[PDB]
Swiss-Prot record, chains A, B, C, D:
It comes from the Eukaryota. It is found in: Cytoplasm; Lysosome. Interacts with VIM and HINT1. Interacts with IKBKG/NEMO. Interacts with STING1. The chain holds residues 259 to 346 of 587 of the full protein. Transmembrane segments: none annotated. This is Tripartite motif-containing protein 29. Plays a crucial role in the regulation of macrophage activation in response to viral or bacterial infections within the respiratory tract. Mechanistically, TRIM29 interacts with IKBKG/NEMO in the lysosome where it induces its 'Lys-48' ubiquitination and subsequent degradation. In turn, the expression of type I interferons and the production of pro-inflammatory cytokines are inhibited. Additionally, induces the 'Lys-48' ubiquitination of STING1 in a similar way, leading to its degradation. Residues 2-89 form a coiled coil. Disruption phenotype: Absence of TRIM29 enhances macrophage production of type I interferons and protects mice from infection with influenza virus. The lineage of its organism: Eukaryota, Metazoa, Chordata, Craniata, Vertebrata.
Amino acid sequence: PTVEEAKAEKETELSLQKEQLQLKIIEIEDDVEKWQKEKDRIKSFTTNEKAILEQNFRDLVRELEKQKEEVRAALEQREQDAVDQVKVI
Amino acid sequence: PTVEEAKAEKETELSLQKEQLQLKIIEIEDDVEKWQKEKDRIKSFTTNEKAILEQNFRDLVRELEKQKEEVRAALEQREQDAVDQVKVI
Amino acid sequence: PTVEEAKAEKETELSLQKEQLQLKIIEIEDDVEKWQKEKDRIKSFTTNEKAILEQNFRDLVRELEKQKEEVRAALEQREQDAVDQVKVI
Amino acid sequence: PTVEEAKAEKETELSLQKEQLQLKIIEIEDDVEKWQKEKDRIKSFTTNEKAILEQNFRDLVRELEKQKEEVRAALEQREQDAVDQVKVI
């Protein structure tokens, strides 16, 4: 080959090989950013679900405390009822 | 009647009437002490039942808190499981 | 005394004595109603103060739970801070 | 150089260069394992401190609940004391 022909071929080859390398880097980086976004999404979902669990628990305890209060005041009303039902004879 | 006969009769009558009065007082007082002991017993029962209620409530809350903890650690294990299941491709 | 004079005197005496008896009953009943109203007022005050105590306790626990949450999230921020401060060298 | 001399030199050079490469890999891997062990240690410390926080909180609440109970029973004793201090006159 001519000196000018081998020059031009080298330039073509390097230009095409550069582009291959760049594409592969883009692929690696897309895969990594997608991996990382998924990991972060799962973390974010768990954090949310734990917050909702914690709020369910607090609502449950509050509802049960309120039921306990109803039973207590019932006990106190059966009490006074019974104390008035006891005659002096 | 002789003076000595009316004397002796008065003494008999007063002695028998005193005894009637005393018996009635004993009856009134028995009824009152029994009334009061019953009132006190019912109060004492209610106090006991409320204490047992309060301890049931505390055991229930403790058991539910412990269940919440199991669900939370389950959520965290499905989490790490899932984070390891996400490939880098 | 004349029959008509003793009649009239008896009526005066009974009328004045009735009024004495009635006044004493009114006094007994005033004292009893006042006793009972005071007892009821003290009971009512205690019931109120216990309710306010119970609400103070609940506000205190809620405030402390909220402070615990701040300390926990502080611990988690010193954590991530520290994990990023550890070099790969 | 002799064919046998260039052979022997190539072998020396490759052997020394291999060893350089291996050492660098060992260094990279030591740094990475140390990084990772430190990250894990900090995580492990935070987890511990949060557990101790959580147990302090529970002991605090239990102590305060117990103090509330003392104040309540004090209120009830000033109550009965006062109810007995109210005369019938």
